[PDB]
Amino acid sequence: HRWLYPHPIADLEAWTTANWEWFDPVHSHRILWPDREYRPDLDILIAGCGTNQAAIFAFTNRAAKVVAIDISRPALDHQQYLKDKHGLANLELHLLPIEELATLGRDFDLVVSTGVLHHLADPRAGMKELAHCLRRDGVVAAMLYGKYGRIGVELLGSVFRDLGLGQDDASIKLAKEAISLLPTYHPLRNYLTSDSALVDTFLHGRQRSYTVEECVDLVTSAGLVFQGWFHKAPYYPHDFFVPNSEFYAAVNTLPEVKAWSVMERLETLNATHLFMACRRDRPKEQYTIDFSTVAALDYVPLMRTRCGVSGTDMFWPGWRMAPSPAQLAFLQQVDGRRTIREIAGCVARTSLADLEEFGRKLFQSLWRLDFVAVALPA
Amino acid sequence: WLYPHPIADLEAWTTANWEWFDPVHSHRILWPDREYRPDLDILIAGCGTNQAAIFAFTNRAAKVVAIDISRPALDHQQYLKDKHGLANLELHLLPIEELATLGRDFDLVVSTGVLHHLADPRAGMKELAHCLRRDGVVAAMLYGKYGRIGVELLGSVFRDLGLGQDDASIKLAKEAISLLPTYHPLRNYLTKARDLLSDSALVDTFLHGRQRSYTVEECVDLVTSAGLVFQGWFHKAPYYPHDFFVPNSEFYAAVNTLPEVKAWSVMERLETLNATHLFMACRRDRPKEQYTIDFSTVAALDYVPLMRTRCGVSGTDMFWPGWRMAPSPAQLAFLQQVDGRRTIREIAGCVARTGGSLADLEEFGRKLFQSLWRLDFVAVALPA
Ligand SMILES: Nc1ncnc2c1ncn2[C@@H]1O[C@H](CSCC[C@H](N)C(=O)O)[C@@H](O)[C@H]1O
Ligand SMILES: Nc1ncnc2c1ncn2[C@@H]1O[C@H](CSCC[C@H](N)C(=O)O)[C@@H](O)[C@H]1O
Numbered sequence: 048h049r050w051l052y053p054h055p056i057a058d059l060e061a062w063t064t065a066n067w068e069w070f071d072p073v074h075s076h077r078i079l080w081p082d083r084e085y086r087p088d089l090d091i092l093i094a095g096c097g098t099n100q101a102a103i104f105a106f107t108n109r110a111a112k113v114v115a116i117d118i119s120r121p122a123l124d125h126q127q128y129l130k131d132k133h134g135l136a137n138l139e140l141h142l143l144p145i146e147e148l149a150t151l152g153r154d155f156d157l158v159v160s161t162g163v164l165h166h167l168a169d170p171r172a173g174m175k176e177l178a179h180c181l182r183r184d185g186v187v188a189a190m191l192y193g194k195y196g197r198i199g200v201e202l203l204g205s206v207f208r209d210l211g212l213g214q215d216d217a218s219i220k221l222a223k224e225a226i227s228l229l230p231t232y233h234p235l236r237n238y239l240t241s242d243s244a245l246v247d248t249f250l251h252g253r254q255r256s257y258t259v260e261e262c263v264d265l266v267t268s269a270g271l272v273f274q275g276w277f278h279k280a281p282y283y284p285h286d287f288f289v290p291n292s293e294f295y296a297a298v299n300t301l302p303e304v305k306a307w308s309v310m311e312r313l314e315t316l317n318a319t320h321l322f323m324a325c326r327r328d329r330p331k332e333q334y335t336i337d338f339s340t341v342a343a344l345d346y347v348p349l350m351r352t353r354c355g356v357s358g359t360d361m362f363w364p365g366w367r368m369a370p371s372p373a374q375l376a377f378l379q380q381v382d383g384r385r386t387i388r389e390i391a392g393c394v395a396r397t398s399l400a401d402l403e404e405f406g407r408k409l410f411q412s413l414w415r416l417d418f419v420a421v422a423l424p425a
Numbered sequence: 426w427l428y429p430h431p432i433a434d435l436e437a438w439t440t441a442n443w444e445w446f447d448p449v450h451s452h453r454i455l456w457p458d459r460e461y462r463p464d465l466d467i468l469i470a471g472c473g474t475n476q477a478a479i480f481a482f483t484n485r486a487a488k489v490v491a492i493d494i495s496r497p498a499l500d501h502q503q504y505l506k507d508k509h510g511l512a513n514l515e516l517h518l519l520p521i522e523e524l525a526t527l528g529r530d531f532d533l534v535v536s537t538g539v540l541h542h543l544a545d546p547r548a549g550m551k552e553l554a555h556c557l558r559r560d561g562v563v564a565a566m567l568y569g570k571y572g573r574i575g576v577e578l579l580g581s582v583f584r585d586l587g588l589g590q591d592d593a594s595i596k597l598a599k600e601a602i603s604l605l606p607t608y609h610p611l612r613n614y615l616t617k618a619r620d621l622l623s624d625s626a627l628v629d630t631f632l633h634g635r636q637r638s639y640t641v642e643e644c645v646d647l648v649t650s651a652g653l654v655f656q657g658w659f660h661k662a663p664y665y666p667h668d669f670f671v672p673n674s675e676f677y678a679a680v681n682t683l684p685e686v687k688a689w690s691v692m693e694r695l696e697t698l699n700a701t702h703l704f705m706a707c708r709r710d711r712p713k714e715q716y717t718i719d720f721s722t723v724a725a726l727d728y729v730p731l732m733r734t735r736c737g738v739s740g741t742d743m744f745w746p747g748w749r750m751a752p753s754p755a756q757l758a759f760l761q762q763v764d765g766r767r768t769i770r771e772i773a774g775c776v777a778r779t780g781g782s783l784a785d786l787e788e789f790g791r792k793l794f795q796s797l798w799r800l801d802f803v804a805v806a807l808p809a
Contacts, residue, residue, distance in 0.1 A: 198574060198610070202694040209687060210679055224676040225695070232698055234574070237608040294600040297586055309585055312578045313601070316608050 048119070048251075049214040050243040055125045056099045059106040059133055067352065068100065069277055069321060070159045070188035073107045074352045078277060079157065079186045079323060081423040082333045087111065092155040092180055094145050095163030097122050102129035104159070105138035114151060116143040148176045155180050161190035161321075164265075165255040174269035178326070184333065186274065187324040191265075192256040195311055196318030199235025201256065204249050214246050222249055237316060257320055259307045266324040273304075274334050277321035281314050282307040283415035336421055338411035344403060347422035348390070348410050349383035354418050356381070363418060377409050381419065426590060428629040430620065431501045432475045435482045435509055443734065444476065445659055445703055446535050446564035449483045450734045454659060455533065455562045455705060457807040458715040463487065468531040470521050470553060471539030474498050478505035480535070481514035490527065492519040524552045531556055537566035537703075540647075541637040550651035550706070560715065562656065563706040567647070568638040571693055572700030575611025577638065580631050590628050598631055613698055639702055641689045648706040656716055659703035663696050664689040665799035718805055720795035726770040726787055729806035730763045730794050736802050738763070745802060755780060759793050763803065769794055 056062045067074050076085045087110040093101035094116055101115030106129075115138065117123055123140045130138050143150065145160070145167065158177050167173040177187045203225065212218035219242060229235055257265070259282070266273045276282050283306070284295035298309050311317075325334065337343065350356075353364040356378050360367050370378065376397065380390040387410055391402040413419050432438045443450050452461045463486040469477035470492055477491030482505075491514065493499050499516045506514050519526065521536070521543065534553045543549040553563050579601065588594035599622065605611055620626050630636075639647070641664065648655045658664050665688070666677035680691050693699070707716065719725065735746040738760045742749050752760065758779065762772040773786040781789065797803045 195578065202571065202697070206691050206694050209683070209691060221676050221679060224674065228671060228674065228676060228695075230696065230698070232613040233695070234610060234697060289604065292600065292604065294597050294604060297597060301586070305585060309582050312582050313604070313609070314606065315578070315610060316606065 048121075049246060051098050051121055051125065052243050052247040053098050053100075054241075054243050056103075056129070059103060059129060062099075063103065063107060068103050068107075070157070070161065071104060071107050072111075072157060075277070077349060077420040077422060078351075079188065080184070080333065081336065081421060082425060086156070089156040090114075090153070090182075092116075092148075092151075092153075092158045092177075094148065094158060094160040094177055094180075095166075096126060096140075097162075098125040099129070100159070100161065101138060101140070102126050102133070102135060105130075105135040106133055109137060111137060112139070113137055114139045114141070114153065114155070116141045116145070116148065116151075118142065118144050145173045145176050148180050151180070153180070154182045154185065156182055156185050158185065158187045159189075160187065162192075162319075164189060165191060165257075170255070170265060171268050174265055174271070174324075178269045178271050178324075181271075181326055183326060184329050185325065187266075187271065188277070189320075189322055189324065191262055191320045191322075192254055193311065193318050193320050194256045194258045194261075195315040196238070197254075197256045198315075199233060199238045200248055200318075201253070202233075203229075203235055204253060207249055208253070212250055214250050218250060219245065238318060259311045259320070260304065262320045262322055263304055266322070269324070270327065271324040272327055272329070274323035274325045275336070276307075277323065278317075278417050279415045280417050281317035282310050284310065285416060287412040287416055332423065334423070336414065336423075338407055338414065343407050343411075344388040345386050345424055346410065347383060347386055348381045348413075348419040349422060350381060351417055351420050361418065363416075373405070374409060377406055383422070426625045426628050427474055427497055427501065428625045429473050429475055430623060430625055432479075432505070435479060435505060438475075439479065439482060444479050444483075446533075446537065447480060447483050448487075448533060451659070453731055453804045453806060454733075455564065456560070456715065457718065457805060458809060462532070465532040466490075466529070466558075468492075468524075468529075468534045468553075468556060470524065470534055470536040471542075472498070472502060472516075473538075474501040475505070476535070476537065477514060477516070478502050478509070478511060481506075481511040482509055485513060487513060488515070489513055490515045490517070490529065490531070492517045492521065492524065492527075494518065494520050521549045521552050524556050527556075529556065530558045530561070532558055532561045534561065534563045535565075536563065538568075538701075540565060540567060541639075546637070547647055547650050550647055550653070554651045554653050554706075554708070557653075557708060559708060560711055561707065563648075563653065564659070565702075565704055565706065567644055567702045567704075568636055569693065569700050569702050570638045570640045570643075571697045572614065573636075573638040574697075575609065575614045576630055576700075577635065578609075579605075579611055580635060583631055584634070588632055590632055594632055595624055595627060598627060614700060617698065617700075641693045641702070642686060644702045644704055645686055648704070651706070652709065653706040654709055654711070656705035656707045657718070658689075659705065660699075660801050661799045662801050663699035664692050666692065667800060669796040669800055714807065716807070718798065718807075720791055720798065725791050725795070727768050727808060728794065729765065729768055730772070730797075730803040731765040731806060732763060733801055733804050743802065745800075755789070756793060759790055765806070 072089055089111045091104055091111050091113045096115035096117050101113055105113040115126055126140050158180050160177055164170045164173045263273045284298050286295050298306055359369050361370050361378055376394050377390055380393045387406045388403060391406040395402050410419060448465060465487045467480055467487050467489045472491035472493050477489055481489040491502060499518060502516050534557055540546045540549045645655045666680050668677055680688055741751050743752050743760055758776045759772055762775045769790045770787055773790040777783055777786050794803055
C-alpha cells in the first residue's frame with residue numbers, strides 16, 4: 048500500500064452535504080429494517096472501516112455508538128483525525144482483524160463490511176464472525192466484487208502480474224499506456240465509463256470476485272439468511288422499460304436466486320454485489336417483500352434517496368423520464384404514509400380491483416428499479 | 426438442423442470463399458521450406474457437411490479421407506462428391522477415437538472446431554499424432570476463452586431456462602439477444618458473426634450445450650501432451666503486439682521481452698475479439714529448419730517474403746482482406762520489391778540502388794518483415 052485507499056476525506060461537513068454512504072441508516076433505514084422508523088441510537092459495527100467510512104457513520108448518526116475495526120494503523124489514524132476534527136465522541140476505533148471480533152464482547156443492530164471480505168484468507172470464517180456480532184433483528188450490510196462486471200479488471204490485472212509490475216512510478220506509467228492501447232471493444236472500456244484507485248484496482252494482486260450464487264452460499268454457510276440487495280436494478284428484468292417481453296416473463300418464472308443469477312449474466316456493467324444478511328430467528332414479517340400476495344396492498348411505498356416526482360417527470364439519481372399518465376397518477380399519491388390499497392383508492396376518486404392490481408404491479412416494477420422502498424406493518 | 430450450413434454448389438462457393446488450411450492457398454504457412462504439392466494425402470478429422478468436399482474440389486490430384494460421427498453430414502459430402510465427381514474423396518462414419526482402423530498416415534490432418542466435442546480432447550490429438558507422417562502438419566481450431574465470454578454467458582442462461590432446439594426456444598433466444606445491453610460481451614462477437622442468427626448456427630452456438638473454450642497456454646499444453654510440437658498460429662495478428670501500427674511503445678517492448686508463450690498469453694487478454702485459436706502442430710522429429718521462423722537471427726536475411734492470400738500493394742497502398750492503408754515511403758519501397766523470389770537481403774539491395782547504408786536497410790528490412798509477418802501480411806519461404 049504506497050498510498051492510503053480509499054482516498055482520505057479532509058472535511059465531513061463538505062463531504063456529507065454532497066455525498067452519502069449506501070448503508071448509512073439515516074438514508075437507508077427502511078431498506079435494512081422495512082418494519083420500523085429511523086432509530087438514532089443504533090449500535091453500529093464497521094468491520095474494515097478503512098480511512099473514512101466509520102467517521103462518516105458517526106458524523107451522520109450523532110446519537111449512535113459506532114465501533115470500527117481495521118488491521119491498518121494509517122487507516123485508523125485518519126479516522127482519529129476525523130474523530131478529533133468533528134468531535135465524534137460516539138466513534139470507538141480498534142486495530143483488530145475481523146477474525147478477532149469476539150474480543151469486543153458486543154453484538155450490534157448494524158454490521159457494515161464493504162469491500163473487505165475477499166482480502167481475507169477465509170472469507171467464510173469472516174462472515175461467521177460478522178454473524179456472531181449480530182442481534183436478533185440486526186443486519187449485515189456487505190459488498191463483494193461481482194464476477195462478470197470485473198472481467199476487464201481481472202484481464203489487465205493478470206497481465207500486469209505476468210510482467211512483474213508493482214506500485215512504483217515506472218509500473219503506473221506502463222499501466223496507463225497499456226489502458227490507452229486497449230482496443231475500443233475490450234471489456235475494461237465499459238468498466239472505465241486517481242493513481243491511488245488505479246494501484247488498488249490493477250497493481251495490488253488478484254481481488255476475488257463473486258457470482259450471485261457464491262454471495263448467497265457465503266451468507267448461508269455462516270448460518271445467516273440472504274435478506275436481499277441494496278440495489279435491486281441489476282438483479283431483475285426491467286419490465287417497467289420493456290413490458291410484455293416473453294423472455295423477461297420466462298426469467299420472472301424462476302425462483303428468486305436462479306432469476307438473479309440469470310440477470311447477472313445479462314446485465315454485466317454492475318461490478319459490485321451490495322447485499323444484506325440477517326439471522327434465521329429474525330421474524331420474516333420484519334423484512335420479507337413479496338408483491339405477489341394480498342399482503343402487498345398494506346405496503347407503504349416511499350421515495351428512495353434522491354428519487355421522486357417533479358411535475359410529469361419521475362427521477363432517480365442522474366436519470367429522469369416521463370411515465371404514462373396512468374403511472375404518474377399513482378406516483379403523485381406516494382407520501383410515505385398511504386398504502387398501495389389507499390393509493391388506488393385516491394386515484395379511483397379522479398374498477399377498484401383493477402387499480403389495486405395496477406398499483407401492486409407498478410410498485411413491484413419500481414421497487415425492483417430502486418425508485419421506491421416499502422414500509423411493512425410494525 | 427445440419428451444421429455447418431450445407432453448401433449447394435462448390436463452383437459458386439470456391440470463386441468467392443476459401444478454407445484457411447487449404448494447401449492450395451496456405452502451403453507456405455504449413456510447409457515454409459517447399460513449393461505447393463498437388464498429390465498430398467489429406468485427413469479431414471470431423472469434416473462436417475462441406476469441408477472435405479471443398480479440399481477434394483480444390484486439390485483434384487490429392488487423396489482426401491474424411492471422417493465424421495454424423496450420417497447426415499457425410500450424406501451432404503456424398504451429394505457434393507456425386508455433383509462434382511470428387512473421385513479423390515473417401516468418406517467414413519468413424520469417430521477420431523477409431524482413426525487407427527483406417528491403417529493410414531497423412532501429410533496434412535485438418536481438425537477444425539471438432540476436438541472440444543470429444544470426451545477426451547487430448548486422446549483425440551494423440552490419435553491425430555499417430556496418423557501424421559514425419560513432415561506432416563495437424564491444422565486445428567479450438568474456441569478461445571476470452572473471445573467466447575458472451576456466448577458462454579447467454580448459453581448458460583438458456584440452459585438454466587430449460588431451452589432446447591424447438592422453434593419456441595429459438596424465438597426466445599433471438600428476443601434475449603435483442604434485449605442485451607450495448608456493453609454486453611456478446612455484442613462485439615455478434616458484429617463479426619455474419620451467419621450466427623441462422624437457425625442451424627444459432628442452435629449450434631447457444632442451444633446444444635457448453636462448448637469448451639481454451640486459453641493460448643491450454644492449446645499449447647494440449648499439443649505438447651499429445652507428443653507434438655506447437656508449430657505456430659495461422660493468423661499471428663491476435664498473438665503479437667501490433668508494433669507496425671504503434672512503434673516505440675515501452676509497454677509493447679515489455680510484452681516482447683517475455684518468453685513466446687507468455688507473450689501470446691498476454692496478447693490474448695488485450696485482444697479479446699478473436700474467438701478462435703487456429704494453430705499448427707507437427708512431430709518433434711520433423712527437422713526444425715523446415716518451419717522455424719525467427720526474425721531475430723542473421724538467417725532471417727535469407728527469408729523470401731510472399732504476399733498472403735488477398736494481401737498486396739496497389740500504388741501507394743498496402744491491403745489485407747477488409748483493410749487498406751498507406752505505409753511510409755521508406756516502407757512502400759521495400760513492399761514494392763516483394764515478388765515471392767527475392768530474399769530480405771536482396772530486397773534491401775534493390776532499395777539501396779534508389780536514407781541508409783546497406784547494413785541499415787537490411788536491418789530496416791528484417792524489422793519491417795518481422796512486423797508484417799506478425800500481422801499476416803507476408804509469409805516467408807525458408808531455404809529447401
Ligand atoms: N482481516 C481483516 N480485518 C479487518 N479489516 C481488514 C482485514 N483485511 C483487510 N482489511 C481492511 O479492509 C479495508 C478494505 S477497503 C474498504 C474500506 C471501507 N469498508 C469502505 O467501504 O470505504 C482496508 O482498510 C483493509 O486494511
Ligand atoms: N469423436 C468425433 N469424431 C469425429 N467427428 C466428430 C466427433 N465428435 C464430433 N464430431 C463432428 O465434428 C464436427 C464439428 S463441426 C465442424 C465441421 C468442419 N470441421 C468445419 O470446419 O466446417 C461435427 O460434424 C461433429 O459431428
